[PDB]
Structure formats: C-alpha cells, structure tokens
Amino acid sequence: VAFHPSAAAYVSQIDTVEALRDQDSFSDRIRALHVYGGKVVRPTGVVVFNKTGS
Amino acid sequence: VAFHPSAAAYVSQIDTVEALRDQDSFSDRIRALHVYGGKVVRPTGVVVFNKTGS
C-alpha cells in the first residue's frame, strides 16, 4: 500500500488490563480490553497493489 | 389512614450496599440487599378511608 499519513486515521480510546481470581478454580485471571477505531478519511490518498490478495 | 404509631410495627434488619468487579464483562456491578418486616400489631388502632380504592 502507498499512502500519505493524512489519508487514514486511527483512534485508541480504551486500553486496560485487570487482575482477578477465577470463580471456578484456584487460579489467577488476567484480562485486557482494547477499544479503537479507524477510517480511510481520503480514499484517493491510499493506493493498493494486489487488493484481493488473501 | 388515621393511626396511632403504636398500632403498627416495622423492622429494618439488614440494609447493605456493595461493589464487585463483574465476572462475565468489563463492568462494575453495584448490588444492594434490604431485609425487613412489618405488621399491624393492633388492627383497631388504624382507621382507613377508601380502603378498597386503587
């Protein structure tokens, strides 16, 4: 992909990690949440070679 | 209702409020419990106008 940095945007809104005890066993539980979003705000500012590549 | 205070009793036995990290999601949980009882200990000491009204 060829682009200018201004053509696409990203937001990290939440990023947290948490420690608990398991209810069903003698275990620690570690869990983490990430909430984010992003958009190509200017589509002509991004050029893609092999776009169907999977 | 026209009554004398002594004609009816009420007991607040438990009234507790609690906060606990939720188990199934990244959420706070607020929970509260109230345990109580009441009786008219003298039924003639309480006079009700429009008793059947709703």
Side-chain angles (χ1 to χ4, degrees), chain A residues 16 18 20 23-24 29 31-33, chain B residues 20-28:
Chain A
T16 58
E18 184 185 5
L20 297 171
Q23 291 296 318
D24 304 337
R29 176 180 181 190
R31 66 180 190 197
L33 180 68
Chain B
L20 62 80
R21 295 255 58 198
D22 196 49
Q23 178 190 355
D24 300 344
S25 75
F26 296 84
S27 306
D28 297 328

Short mmCIF file of all heavy atoms in Angstrom, two decimals, chain A residues 16 18 20 23-24 29 31-33, chain B residues 20-28:
data_model
loop_
_atom_site.label_atom_id
_atom_site.label_comp_id
_atom_site.label_asym_id
_atom_site.label_seq_id
_atom_site.Cartn_x
_atom_site.Cartn_y
_atom_site.Cartn_z
N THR A 16 -6.93 -1.17 28.69
CA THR A 16 -6.78 -1.53 30.11
C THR A 16 -6.53 -3.01 30.33
O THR A 16 -6.95 -3.86 29.54
CB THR A 16 -8.00 -1.10 30.95
OG1 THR A 16 -9.18 -1.67 30.44
CG2 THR A 16 -8.20 0.41 30.99
N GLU A 18 -6.44 -5.99 33.76
CA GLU A 18 -7.16 -6.25 35.01
C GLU A 18 -6.78 -7.62 35.58
O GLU A 18 -6.64 -8.59 34.84
CB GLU A 18 -8.65 -6.18 34.64
CG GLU A 18 -9.67 -6.32 35.77
CD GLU A 18 -11.11 -6.34 35.22
OE1 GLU A 18 -11.32 -6.36 34.00
OE2 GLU A 18 -12.09 -6.37 35.99
N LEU A 20 -7.86 -10.62 38.54
CA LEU A 20 -8.96 -11.23 39.29
C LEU A 20 -8.56 -12.62 39.78
O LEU A 20 -7.52 -13.16 39.41
CB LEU A 20 -10.19 -11.31 38.37
CG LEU A 20 -10.77 -9.98 37.88
CD1 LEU A 20 -11.83 -10.28 36.84
CD2 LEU A 20 -11.43 -9.17 39.00
N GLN A 23 -13.53 -17.76 39.60
CA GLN A 23 -14.62 -18.27 40.42
C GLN A 23 -14.64 -19.80 40.48
O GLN A 23 -15.06 -20.33 41.50
CB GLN A 23 -15.95 -17.76 39.87
CG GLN A 23 -16.11 -16.26 40.08
CD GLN A 23 -16.17 -15.87 41.55
OE1 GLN A 23 -16.81 -16.51 42.36
NE2 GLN A 23 -15.53 -14.80 41.95
N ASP A 24 -14.19 -20.51 39.46
CA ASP A 24 -14.37 -21.96 39.37
C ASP A 24 -13.12 -22.78 39.71
O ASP A 24 -13.17 -24.00 39.71
CB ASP A 24 -14.91 -22.36 38.01
CG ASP A 24 -16.22 -21.68 37.61
OD1 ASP A 24 -16.98 -21.22 38.48
OD2 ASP A 24 -16.50 -21.63 36.39
N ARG A 29 -6.87 -14.86 37.21
CA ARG A 29 -7.40 -14.47 35.90
C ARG A 29 -6.81 -13.12 35.54
O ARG A 29 -6.90 -12.18 36.32
CB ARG A 29 -8.93 -14.50 35.95
CG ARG A 29 -9.62 -14.02 34.67
CD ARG A 29 -11.12 -14.10 34.86
NE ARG A 29 -11.88 -13.69 33.67
CZ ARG A 29 -13.18 -13.49 33.62
NH1 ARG A 29 -13.91 -13.56 34.68
NH2 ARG A 29 -13.77 -13.19 32.51
N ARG A 31 -7.22 -10.34 32.43
CA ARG A 31 -7.98 -9.93 31.25
C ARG A 31 -7.65 -8.51 30.83
O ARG A 31 -7.29 -7.69 31.67
CB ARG A 31 -9.48 -10.21 31.43
CG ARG A 31 -10.18 -9.39 32.52
CD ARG A 31 -11.67 -9.76 32.60
NE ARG A 31 -12.39 -8.81 33.45
CZ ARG A 31 -13.57 -8.92 34.01
NH1 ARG A 31 -14.34 -9.94 33.82
NH2 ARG A 31 -13.99 -8.01 34.81
N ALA A 32 -7.72 -8.21 29.55
CA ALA A 32 -7.41 -6.90 28.99
C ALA A 32 -8.39 -6.52 27.88
O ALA A 32 -8.77 -7.37 27.09
CB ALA A 32 -5.96 -6.88 28.50
N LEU A 33 -8.77 -5.26 27.82
CA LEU A 33 -9.71 -4.70 26.86
C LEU A 33 -9.02 -3.62 26.04
O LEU A 33 -8.36 -2.75 26.59
CB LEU A 33 -10.92 -4.15 27.62
CG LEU A 33 -12.02 -3.54 26.74
CD1 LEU A 33 -12.73 -4.58 25.88
CD2 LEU A 33 -13.04 -2.83 27.61
N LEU B 20 -18.60 -4.94 43.30
CA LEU B 20 -17.72 -6.11 42.99
C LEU B 20 -17.39 -6.09 41.50
O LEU B 20 -18.28 -5.79 40.72
CB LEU B 20 -18.40 -7.42 43.44
CG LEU B 20 -19.73 -7.82 42.79
CD1 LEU B 20 -19.51 -8.46 41.42
CD2 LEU B 20 -20.54 -8.77 43.66
N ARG B 21 -16.15 -6.38 41.12
CA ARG B 21 -15.78 -6.43 39.68
C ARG B 21 -16.65 -7.53 39.07
O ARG B 21 -16.72 -8.61 39.70
CB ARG B 21 -14.28 -6.69 39.47
CG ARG B 21 -13.37 -5.59 39.99
CD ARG B 21 -12.77 -4.71 38.90
NE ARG B 21 -13.80 -4.05 38.08
CZ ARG B 21 -13.64 -3.49 36.88
NH1 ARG B 21 -12.46 -3.46 36.26
NH2 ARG B 21 -14.69 -2.94 36.29
N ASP B 22 -17.27 -7.29 37.91
CA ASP B 22 -18.21 -8.28 37.32
C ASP B 22 -17.41 -9.49 36.84
O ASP B 22 -16.18 -9.38 36.79
CB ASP B 22 -19.10 -7.69 36.22
CG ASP B 22 -20.29 -8.57 35.89
OD1 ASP B 22 -21.00 -8.98 36.83
OD2 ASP B 22 -20.50 -8.86 34.70
N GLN B 23 -18.06 -10.64 36.62
CA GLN B 23 -17.37 -11.85 36.20
C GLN B 23 -17.36 -11.98 34.67
O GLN B 23 -16.33 -12.31 34.10
CB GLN B 23 -18.03 -13.06 36.86
CG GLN B 23 -17.44 -14.42 36.46
CD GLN B 23 -18.27 -15.61 36.94
OE1 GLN B 23 -19.26 -15.50 37.64
NE2 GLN B 23 -17.87 -16.81 36.59
N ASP B 24 -18.46 -11.71 34.00
CA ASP B 24 -18.59 -12.01 32.57
C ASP B 24 -18.22 -10.86 31.64
O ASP B 24 -18.15 -11.06 30.44
CB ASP B 24 -19.98 -12.55 32.27
CG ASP B 24 -20.34 -13.83 33.01
OD1 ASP B 24 -19.46 -14.52 33.55
OD2 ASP B 24 -21.53 -14.19 33.01
N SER B 25 -17.96 -9.65 32.14
CA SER B 25 -17.68 -8.49 31.29
C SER B 25 -16.81 -7.47 32.00
O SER B 25 -16.64 -7.50 33.21
CB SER B 25 -18.99 -7.86 30.84
OG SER B 25 -19.59 -7.13 31.88
N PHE B 26 -16.23 -6.56 31.23
CA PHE B 26 -15.56 -5.38 31.77
C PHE B 26 -16.64 -4.39 32.20
O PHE B 26 -17.05 -3.52 31.44
CB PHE B 26 -14.58 -4.82 30.73
CG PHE B 26 -13.44 -5.74 30.36
CD1 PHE B 26 -13.62 -6.72 29.38
CD2 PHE B 26 -12.18 -5.60 30.97
CE1 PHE B 26 -12.56 -7.54 28.99
CE2 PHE B 26 -11.12 -6.43 30.59
CZ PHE B 26 -11.31 -7.40 29.59
N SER B 27 -17.17 -4.59 33.39
CA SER B 27 -18.20 -3.77 34.01
C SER B 27 -17.98 -3.71 35.51
O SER B 27 -17.56 -4.69 36.12
CB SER B 27 -19.60 -4.35 33.82
OG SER B 27 -19.92 -4.61 32.48
N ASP B 28 -18.36 -2.61 36.14
CA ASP B 28 -18.66 -2.60 37.57
C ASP B 28 -20.04 -3.19 37.82
O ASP B 28 -20.94 -3.01 37.01
CB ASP B 28 -18.64 -1.17 38.11
CG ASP B 28 -17.28 -0.50 38.01
OD1 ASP B 28 -16.25 -1.20 38.09
OD2 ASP B 28 -17.26 0.74 37.86
#
